[PDB]
Structure formats: C-alpha cells, structure tokens
Amino acid sequence: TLAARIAISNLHKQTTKQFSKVVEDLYRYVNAATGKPAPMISDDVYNIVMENKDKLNSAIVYDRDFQYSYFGFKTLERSYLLRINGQVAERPQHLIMRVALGIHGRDIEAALETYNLMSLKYFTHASPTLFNAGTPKPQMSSCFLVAMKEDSIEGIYDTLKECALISKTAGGIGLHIHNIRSTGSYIAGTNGTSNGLIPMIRVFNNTARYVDQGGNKRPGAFALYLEPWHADIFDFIDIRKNHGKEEIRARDLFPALWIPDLFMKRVEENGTWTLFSPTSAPGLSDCYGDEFEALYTRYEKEGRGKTIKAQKLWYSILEAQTETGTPFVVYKDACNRKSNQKNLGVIKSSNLCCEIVEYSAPDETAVCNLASVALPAFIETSEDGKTSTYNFKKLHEIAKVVTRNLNRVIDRNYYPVEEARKSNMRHRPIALGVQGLADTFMLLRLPFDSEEARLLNIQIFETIYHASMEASCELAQKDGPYETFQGSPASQGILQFDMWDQKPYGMWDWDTLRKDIMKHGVRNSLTMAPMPTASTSQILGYNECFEPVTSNMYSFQVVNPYLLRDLVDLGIWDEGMKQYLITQNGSIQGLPNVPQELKDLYKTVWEISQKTIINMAADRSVYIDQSHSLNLFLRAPTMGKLTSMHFYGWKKGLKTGMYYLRTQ
Amino acid sequence: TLAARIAISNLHKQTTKQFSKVVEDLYRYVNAATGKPAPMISDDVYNIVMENKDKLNSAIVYDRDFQYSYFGFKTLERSYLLRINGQVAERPQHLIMRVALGIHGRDIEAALETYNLMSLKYFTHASPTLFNAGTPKPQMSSCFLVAMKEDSIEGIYDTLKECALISKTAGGIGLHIHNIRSTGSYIAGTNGTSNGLIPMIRVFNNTARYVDQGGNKRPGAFALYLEPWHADIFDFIDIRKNHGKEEIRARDLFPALWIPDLFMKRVEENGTWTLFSPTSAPGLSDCYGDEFEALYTRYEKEGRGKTIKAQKLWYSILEAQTETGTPFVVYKDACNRKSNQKNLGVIKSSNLCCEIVEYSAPDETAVCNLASVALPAFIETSEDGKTSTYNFKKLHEIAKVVTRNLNRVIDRNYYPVEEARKSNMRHRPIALGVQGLADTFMLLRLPFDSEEARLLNIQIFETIYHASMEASCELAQKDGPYETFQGSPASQGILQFDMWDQKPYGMWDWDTLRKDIMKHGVRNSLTMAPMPTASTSQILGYNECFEPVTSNMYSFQVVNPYLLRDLVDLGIWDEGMKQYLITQNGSIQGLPNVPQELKDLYKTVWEISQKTIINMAADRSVYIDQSHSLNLFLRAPTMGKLTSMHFYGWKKGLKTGMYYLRTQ
Numbered sequence A, B: 001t002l003a004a005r006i007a008i009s010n011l012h013k014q015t016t017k018q019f020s021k022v023v024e025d026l027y028r029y030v031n032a033a034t035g036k037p038a039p040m041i042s043d044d045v046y047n048i049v050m051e052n053k054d055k056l057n058s059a060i061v062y063d064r065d066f067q068y069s070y071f072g073f074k075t076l077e078r079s080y081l082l083r084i085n086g087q088v089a090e091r092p093q094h095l096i097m098r099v100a101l102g103i104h105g106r107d108i109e110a111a112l113e114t115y116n117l118m119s120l121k122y123f124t125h126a127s128p129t130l131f132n133a134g135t136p137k138p139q140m141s142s143c144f145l146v147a148m149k150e151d152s153i154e155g156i157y158d159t160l161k162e163c164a165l166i167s168k169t170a171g172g173i174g175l176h177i178h179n180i181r182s183t184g185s186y187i188a189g190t191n192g193t194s195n196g197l198i199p200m201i202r203v204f205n206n207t208a209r210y211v212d213q214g215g216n217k218r219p220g221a222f223a224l225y226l227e228p229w230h231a232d233i234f235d236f237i238d239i240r241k242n243h244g245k246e247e248i249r250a251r252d253l254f255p256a257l258w259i260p261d262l263f264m265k266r267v268e269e270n271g272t273w274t275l276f277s278p279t280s281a282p283g284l285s286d287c288y289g290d291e292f293e294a295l296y297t298r299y300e301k302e303g304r305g306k307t308i309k310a311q312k313l314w315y316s317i318l319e320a321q322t323e324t325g326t327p328f329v330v331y332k333d334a335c336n337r338k339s340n341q342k343n344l345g346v347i348k349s350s351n352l353c354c355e356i357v358e359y360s361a362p363d364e365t366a367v368c369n370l371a372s373v374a375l376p377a378f379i380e381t382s383e384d385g386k387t388s389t390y391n392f393k394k395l396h397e398i399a400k401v402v403t404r405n406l407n408r409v410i411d412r413n414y415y416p417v418e419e420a421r422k423s424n425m426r427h428r429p430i431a432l433g434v435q436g437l438a439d440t441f442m443l444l445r446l447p448f449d450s451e452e453a454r455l456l457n458i459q460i461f462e463t464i465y466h467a468s469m470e471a472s473c474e475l476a477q478k479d480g481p482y483e484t485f486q487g488s489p490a491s492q493g494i495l496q497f498d499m500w501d502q503k504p505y506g507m508w509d510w511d512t513l514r515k516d517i518m519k520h521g522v523r524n525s526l527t528m529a530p531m532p533t534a535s536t537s538q539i540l541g542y543n544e545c546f547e548p549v550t551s552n553m554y555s556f557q558v559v560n561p562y563l564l565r566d567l568v569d570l571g572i573w574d575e576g577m578k579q580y581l582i583t584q585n586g587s588i589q590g591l592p593n594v595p596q597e598l599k600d601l602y603k604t605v606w607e608i609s610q611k612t613i614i615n616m617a618a619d620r621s622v623y624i625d626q627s628h629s630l631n632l633f634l635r636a637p638t639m640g641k642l643t644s645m646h647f648y649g650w651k652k653g654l655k656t657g658m659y660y661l662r663t664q
C-alpha cells in the first residue's frame, strides 16, 4: 500500500535518470567475467535514441513509475528491468520507452504514442516483448507450435533439437505427437519393437529441464498434444501424476488432449472407443469432422485397433484432472471448423496455454506475439459525476494501436529457428488479449453473473475484434494482405461469428468492415487469443485475463481494494471483518452485516456457477479468431460434476473446453 | 555338463536341418503383426546361397553344434540365433555359415575356410557381427568414438541425434565432451549462465535409456571421456554414485578419465591442479605431452582457472572407483604418443570398454570391428604324448585369416551415420583380441605369474601383431594402403614396440615385415585391441580375454574343469573339497591336502598381485596398436593400494591404466 512510494523511490535513488544515458550504459556494457563486449541494446535502437535524445528524454514522465503497485513493481524489478552487474539499470519508464522503440524503430511518433499509452497502463505487451524488445536479438514471441517432424529416430531427434533451439530464447511450446507409433509397434529397420510415447516424452522432459530459457532463466515449458485414439493415451494423461512408477512419468511437461467430437459422442452414448497406433491407422490427425468420423469408423471395422469402453478412458481423463489439473482439453473439430487458417491444412495442436490455434507442419512452426488490453482503463465517470460509463470508442482506438504494434513485432522479431520465420511471415497471426475483466465488472458495479456483466463482456470482445480487423484491413491496404489470404474464410467475407452461425451484437458496423476486408484483405490471419496474463496482469495490478477473482484477499495482506472501499463506506470495515477473510479464503457470502449488493458483486470464482463461466466464454468466443485459456474452478469435484462441465463446454462449441482444472 | 547333449538335441528336433532351407525361411519371412515382408537375409547372401546350395549345405557338420557348453549354447539361443516368431530358426552351424557368407560373399573358398575355423572354435567375431552379418543392413561394428560437435545447443543436439542414430543399430559409444563450457560460464546469445556438464549428461543418459539398440534389444551404452582439468570434473566422476542428489547423477552412463601426464605428476608431487572451463582455456584437448604442459602452465599462470590441491581431486577419483568401479582411466599422452593414427590429429577419447584408441572429430566418428582368437585351440600334445606345446605357426595363420575377415567387414558394413563411414573408409582400423589366456596357462601347466606364463603371453601377442601386420601388408599390395598411410609412423618403419623404445621378442622376422610395410603399406591403420569378450568368451566356453579366473567355481554349479581333472587324478576330489569351494568363493589356497603345484596354477585373480597383472599388461602392450580393457581387481581396497596400482600402471606407460576396478 505504502510500499510503492517507498521501494520505487529507492530504485530512483539507485538508478540514472536520463533515458539516453541508461541506454548508453546498457549499450556499452561489457561482461566483466570474460571481458566480452555485451551490448544490451541493438545498434539500430541505440542510433535511433542518439539521433533523438532531447525528444525521447523529455517525453518521459518518471512520476508514472508510481502507477505500479508493490508486488507489481517487485515483479518488474526481479525479472523485467535490465540489469548491469546484478544491479537494476532500467526504471520502469525506461523499460517502456525501450519496448516502444524496439517495436516502432524510426517511427518516433508511433513510439511516443505507445510509450504514453503503456506508461498510462492502457495496455502491455507479453513478457518476452518486455524482456527483449530493442535488445540485439529481440525474440519477442511467446508461443511456438511445433509439429513432430517424422515417426523416426531422425525426425524425433530433429524435433528435439528444434525444441531446444526455441527453448533457448524464451517461449513456451505446444508440440503435437500424434504420428509417433505406439508401444509394441513393429520397427522394420532393426526387426525390433517400440516402447511407445513415454520413453520419448522423457527425452523431451529432460530437454525442458536442461534448456532453461537462456542459461539460468526459466525451465523449459512444453505442452504435448495427443488425440485420445492414440494407443499410449492412458499413460500419456498421467504424465504429471504424483505417485509411483517414476520411469513412466514426465513431470516437467503438460499433457493436453486434442479431442475429436466422435470421442465425446461415444462417451455420452456409453459406446466403444478404439485405440490405434498411427501406423495401423494413418491420417486420423490430418482430417477432422465427418471426414475423420468416416475414416476412424472404417479403421475401427477393419479391426486395426484395440476396442474398449469409451467411459473407461473418460473416467481416467477425469481422474488425472482431479489430481494434477491436467490434461487440458481442446476440441479439434471446433478449432478446425471455426479457424481462418483452415485453407492451410488441418490444425494439429494448440499451445502451452491453450489460446493459440494455428497451423503447424514439419517445415512450419506457428508463432504468436501477444499483448493485452487493460479493460479498467476505459471506465469514465460520466458527464455529471456519480455514474460510470464504459468508453468503447477509446477501447476500439487502443486495440487498433495494439494491432499495429503486434504487426511491427512480426517484422522486427528474431526467430529462433527457420520453421518459425517461414510460418510467421506467410500468415502473420497475432494475439490480442485482455486483463482486469473482473476489476471492470467491480468498478462498474456489475456482478460477474449479472445480465449487465454478460452484455459488457460481449460488447468488449466485439469492439476488440472489430478494431483489430479494421487495423489489420488498413495495413493490408498499405502493405498487401498476408501471403495466404486468398482462399481463406475472411477472403470470402466469413468472419469468426459467422462460423458460429451467429449475428454480431452490432455495436459496430460489421458490413462496411466485411466489404473492406473482402476488397483489400487483412494483414494478419488471426488477431484474437485472450491469454492467461499470468505475469503481465501482476505488473499492471489487475486480475488475470477474463476470470473472476479467486479471493477478495491475497496473502503481506492485500484485500480487494474495491471491496475495501465499500466496507469503509458502509461503516462496517473493522477487525471483525478482517478476521472473516484471513480464514475464509477471502469470501464474503453469509457474513452477518453485509449488503446483498456487495455479496453479489464480490463473489469468488468458487462461488460462481461454471455454467456462467462457460456461457460467457461461449459468448466472447464468437469474436475470438483463435481460442482462450479457460481455467475451470471446482470446489467439491466429482465425476458427474466434471462431466457436465466438459459436456456443457463441448456442446457450447468451445475450442478450449478446459485449461487447468483448479480444485478444492 | 550333460545339459549340452540334451538342450542342443532338443534344438535339433525343433529346427530345420538344411542350411539353404533355413535361409529360404529367414529370407521369405513376413512380420505377421503388420503383414510386412521382413527378410532376415540380404538379397546378396540369399542369391549366393541359392547358387551354391549343394556345396554350402554339404560343407556343414552339425555334430559341431556340440562344441558349445550349456551356458554357451543358452547364450546363443537367447540372443544370437535368428528367430522367426519367437521361435529359434537357426542352429549354431547355420549362424556360423551365415556369418561366413556375410563377411566373404562370392568368395566361397574364403567363406568355407572361415566356417570351418569358427565351427572348430579357433576364433569368433564380436556380437554385432554374429547378430547382423549377412542380414539386410549388416551393422557389424561394435565401437563408435564420437566427438562432441560444438560447444553450442545446435552442436550438442546434433551430437545427441548422432548418438541416437548409432545406438539404434547396436554398438557402444565413447563420447568426448572436453569442449563443453563449465558451470557458471557466460552465454553471450542470451546474456545467461551455463549449468555445465551434468544437465547435459542427463539428456544423453535419457537418450541411452530410450534408444535401446533397435527396439527392445539392449539399453544404449555410452562412456563419456573428460580431462581432469575440466571445471565440472568433481560431479562428473560421481555420475554413477548410489547416494542422494538424484538431479546430479547419470546412472546409465560410464565416466572415463582422459588423464594427461601432468595430472599424475602434480598428484605425486603433492602440487596444485587448476580447473578450467574450456572457454577460458582453449585448445587443451587438441594437444598432448610437453606442448600441453606448456599451454596448461601458461593458462594456469595467467589466472584463467581455479586452483586446488591435486590430491583433493585424486582422493575423490579414488573414492568413486571404490564405490562404483568407475571412472575408467586412460592416459591421453601414452595413447597419443604411441599411436599409428598420430598423423591424423590429437586423439580425444577411448571407447566404451577402453580398448579402442582412434581419432575422432565432428565430421569423423571412429569405428571398430572386432574379433577374438581362442588361444587354447593352438595347444598340441607333442609328438610323443605327455608333453603339450603351443602351435605359434597355427596362431600366426589364424590371425592372418581373421585380419582378412575384419577387412572384408569394413567394406561390407552398413554405417549408421555418415561420420562413421567417412572415418572407417579413410583409415580402416581393426581390432583383434584373444580369449582363454587363463585356460591356455592352465592347460599348459603354467601358473599366471610364472616366468613361463610371462614368456608365453609375450610371444602370443608378438605373433598375433606380426600376423595381422603381415596380412594387412598383403592387402595393401593388392588394394593399396589405407588413404592416410603416408606420414604415419608405420610408413616410416615405426611399429608399436618401437614407440615403446623396445626390441621385439624376435620369435618372428620383424625386419622383413618392416621392409615390406615401408615399401607397400598396410591396409589398416591399427590391428590390435584386445577386448573384454564379455559375451563371446561365454559362447566359446573360455575365460574372458586375458584375465586370470575370478573363481575356480561359478554359480547350476560349475567347477574349473582343469582343476576338477586334477583333483580326481590325485584321488582327492570328494564332498569335503566341494564344500571348501561353494563358500570359499572358489579358492584352493591354504586347503589341507592339495599339492603346491595346483595352488600355484589355480590362483584366483584376487590372489595374484596386481603388479603381476600390470607387468604382463605392459609386456603385451608393446604389440598392441591400440589399447586393451584392463580390469583391476582388489580384495581389500585402500587409497594407498589404489594409488600404487594407478601409479605403477602409469609409470609402465600403459594406455588403459584401468577399465573397471573390481572390489571386495
């Protein structure tokens, strides 16, 4: 609370003020232990700063360093602000201006615009952008989707190298492994027999541990995608389990299910399910929908697999989720049917956090560059005091700024492997997200589950998607559409909500936009992918992404500042209320002297129906090009409860049915 | 004992007799589980057999299947004889003839010669030759020496792939890792910090576990070589330790020390030793001898490393050996100074079993193809009964046959990776070994430590080396010398014993041989590398390689048949003697009623001075081109005992100071 106007002030005392001078320092840096020149700013950005020192220097408002809260600034200090010899060299304002120049380069007016908006907290860029923008090999991308190159030792080891090379320069991996022959399958070259996915997973697991994002930075982070017909699927879903059989676990990796609809139909019908090695039943992962169902059903009748009860796999899935939070669940058919990248081929995975849905092949590794809008920044006390409104015009404007930022990032990015460069330059996807939906609903006096909250949510996502496609259409008018625009749904006038067979809310003129996209193209294949903001929401001091709060009281004790405000205002905030928060996980339901309106506004995620979560997720999904990282939260978790959650999500047409399952 | 004329007879009953028909069966084989045609004989050998059926068929003596003892035949049955559907398809005679044709091809007379000699047990070929000769991709090599390609994620992962590809098709790896920067070392590309050798070792460890020699055959087997100046050396030598700190161990790998003389001098002088990351002190592994000492000493004075007490490392080395049997010890300077491959560059490792000393680089992976001579087969009861002599003329003849076999193997071999093919075709090294030295000494009534045993040992190795270079000189007269002959010691008339500055024993005419080699060349850079024969001595029913017996009684109970013979002959073999063998680890020292001559002849390895072992090892070493796998055996192991063993070996000029240390 006070710690901000203390710990920040101490940083000011221990850091140089003048931006161009912190830049000189970073640039002229020499690694003392080896005597090697180790510039922390690229030649390009250094020269830009030198040729514009007065302007950039004078544009910076250091007062804005106090926009950051205690843990927010401590997050920046620990991992974001550049360091010289373990001592922090940058102030937050300097980080921001460095990022702004790293994205925009010689376009100083665009950089100044981005500096102001970010320092004023209208939006931020994902962690690797904050870390690396304007440094010598700026790897600003967060996401890589990697295709297992071939069912062969050569292809497995080439993929492993690729993952190592990507993991070296920060970034999470989603890796699909559907094509790897399962246990017991014949090996012709040596007349041997395969031990299947696990011993292969363990190699990748060790690589994730080894290659810690650049040398003592962060352990490698890989999600693995598998379709539930793969014969190794029972051991795959348990890769994170805590209990014995150590040689069969891979605890540093995350399992994710790439679920076809057929699996869900067989589960609800109480039918059979057939497990195949991909060698016995080829092509299953390279088709989807009815075409998949026809092929699967044929392979099944031809006796090419091993049949079991579907609900046997289901119960095992549900068990692993209860225990480990994993595996994730992403619906293959929804992803494929409702993707603007469908003209590229069949999409075979999502990513580490289940928000990216992009096409990947042995020669093309999908990449994404992310940023999130701070939704609370667009609340304005109305033209009379007392009432608060939402500035949708400003949000539209900011999302357009951010779209343009993320395009610049594509072009200014350093790619770890050639497969990433090829993919990104061809299709140019981007990922806009949000943070502080919860804060926004609170500030505006809208309970998460209210009809008003439901409407705001819809109109916020409509405007972000509309803004991003409008900006992307603008860029295509200047620079041409992305290489692979023609043949795409968008080229035919088919936008995300159309693929859900829905009319848009209509806060914006979609027909003019469609006419414009059909005529001129768009510069980006995809624009929307709301992400966890697990670090960046911490920096800006908002609740992560689009989830309700998990607790009105975290840990240093910190109480929901909107709730705190209310309590003192009602003359009820005392010691007796603080006690009923430290033990009560931070809940205010049932509490003696508390207005009903506060109980409705400050429900914990554990007190909101997951049916409401799914509904609002399905609502916003119609304006998400890609997917979003939907955690599900269950207090008293049972199979029938879990089951209804998955099936409700599935029948809503969600792409990401579940990220983590959070429990207790 | 009787089990042979039982279990073999049952095999006869369950297998087809006619060779060409077992061949047809193997060739026409279809993998039932996939319906894939899976021929177990190459087109080439199949056609050779078909065009020569009467001759090959009729050459085979199936009575010779009874040359194999109980565990000997069980070893063949379990892992060597080809199988159709888990049922054994080959008889031992068929395996032999297949091998003979796999090596010799269209030269039927050479194949028949090899069939007779092998079936009569004059020699055998290493396991992968027995497994793969005459199959479709015959990978007949046992040894690969792999260079870590570069101190970079790219080079580390390329090396890992290479090891995977080699491990796929059977064969042990020696991998040198001297060039990998140690813990804490700077990483420029990401401004990070290295975690050193261990987390990298763990990746290779997992690969060894994964890639089990062709799919459920044998776990991968890698030795890692490191020079003791590397800064990670304390954790490296403990990679096999049993106790806690699991993330720091690599239990499926074998550590080996590549020791420069300087280390040994500093240890005995009670001096200092400096640990370097190879980045701070480049080139140490790419020189040896005085040149190394000059460079090392300069880097040391320039303050480029971390100094400790040498005997601190020494005591740690000695500790790990006591506990784990490892690390192995191979002297870099001896290897390099006394190698015919010295014109190639500096040799940076030995191999899995410490017998191969061959040059390797990022583009050249050294390979070796091995065979062993059964030394007991050359004992002849002299021209009067009663006295036994040794047929050195026959040994010379057989070693010439074997030399020619191993050359053919070079040319007929399937290479797993291109680096192996390049190396082997350029330099063509080969490795002859021996088995049943112990049996030979017993049969002839020579105790292992006697002056007579000492002399036989010398003259046996002189004749094998002489024979092999004579045969290799012959091949160079037909086919030209190996590509890299010129510049080599041998090209200058310098043979192994010369590099020890010694005169040969002189049982053979070395001057005529030298004149011939200098004039015509030799076809092979190296010819001698006596190996463990850990499996193949089991097949032939002899004691492994050149070691004394470990026990006059193994496990089924089996007593030293030469000792048993003696006891019954002296009318002392009874129950009271069998009891003093089941408990006494199989020793006959001190025993009440046993002649002194038997006590001297049937000493266990645990009862022979390791000074005698080292002496006889140093004696034969003068006729070994490469090195040999010298296990050391210590009953009551202490630091001062271990220390004298290492230093005695070192001062003798041994290359392989120690393979395993065997203890208790």
Ligand SMILES: Nc1nc2c(ncn2[C@H]2C[C@H](O)[C@@H](COP(=O)(O)OP(=O)(O)OP(=O)(O)O)O2)c(=O)[nH]1
Binding pocket: A151, A152, A153, A154, A156, A180, A181, A186, A187, A188, A189, A190, A193, A194, A195, A196, A199, B167, B168, B210, B211, B212, B213, B214, B215, B216
């Ligand atoms: N555990 C284990 N798996 C192996 C081994 N060798 C190959 N595999 C696995 C990796 C792949 O999933 C699959 C096929 O491997 P490769 O394509 O490298 O085998 P190859 O071409 O010799 O035979 P193929 O025609 O593919 O059946 O088998 C091995 O030695 N051990």
Ligand SMILES: Nc1nc2c(ncn2[C@H]2C[C@H](O)[C@@H](COP(=O)(O)OP(=O)(O)OP(=O)(O)O)O2)c(=O)[nH]1
Binding pocket: A167, A168, A210, A211, A212, A213, A214, A215, A216, B151, B152, B153, B154, B156, B180, B181, B186, B187, B188, B189, B190, B193, B194, B195, B196, B199
């Ligand atoms: N633990 C860990 N080690 C790494 C990582 N990245 C590289 N290394 C190790 C592997 C090599 O021994 C050494 C150098 O690696 P690279 O050559 O791939 O690094 P780079 O070229 O970016 O920097 P450099 O010029 O070599 O210092 O550092 C990492 O992310 N984590």
Ligand SMILES: Nc1ncnc2c1ncn2[C@@H]1O[C@H](COP(=O)(O)OP(=O)(O)O)[C@@H](O)[C@H]1O
Binding pocket: A125, A126, A127, A128, A142, A143, A144, A170, A171, A172, A173, A218, A219, A220, A221, A351, A352, A353, A354, A355, A370, A531, A532, A533, A534, A535, A536, A537
């Ligand atoms: N530990 C991690 N290591 C590497 N990448 C990560 C990690 N956590 C998340 N990511 C990447 O960042 C993306 C968005 O995650 P998010 O939690 O919004 O990150 P941040 O807020 O730190 O930018 C994910 O899709 C994932 O690819």
Ligand SMILES: Nc1ncnc2c1ncn2[C@@H]1O[C@H](COP(=O)(O)OP(=O)(O)O)[C@@H](O)[C@H]1O
Binding pocket: B125, B126, B127, B128, B142, B143, B144, B170, B171, B172, B173, B218, B219, B220, B221, B351, B352, B353, B354, B355, B370, B531, B532, B533, B534, B535, B536, B537
């Ligand atoms: N478990 C193993 N896996 C792979 N290769 C091995 C293994 N054991 C030994 N080798 C290889 O065989 C060579 C000689 O070993 P040896 O014990 O004589 O084998 P064999 O008698 O089975 O032919 C060694 O130098 C090594 O490279």
Ligand SMILES: [Mg+2]
Binding pocket: A151, A152
């Ligand atoms: Mg293959």
Ligand SMILES: [Mg+2]
Binding pocket: B151, B152
């Ligand atoms: Mg490098």
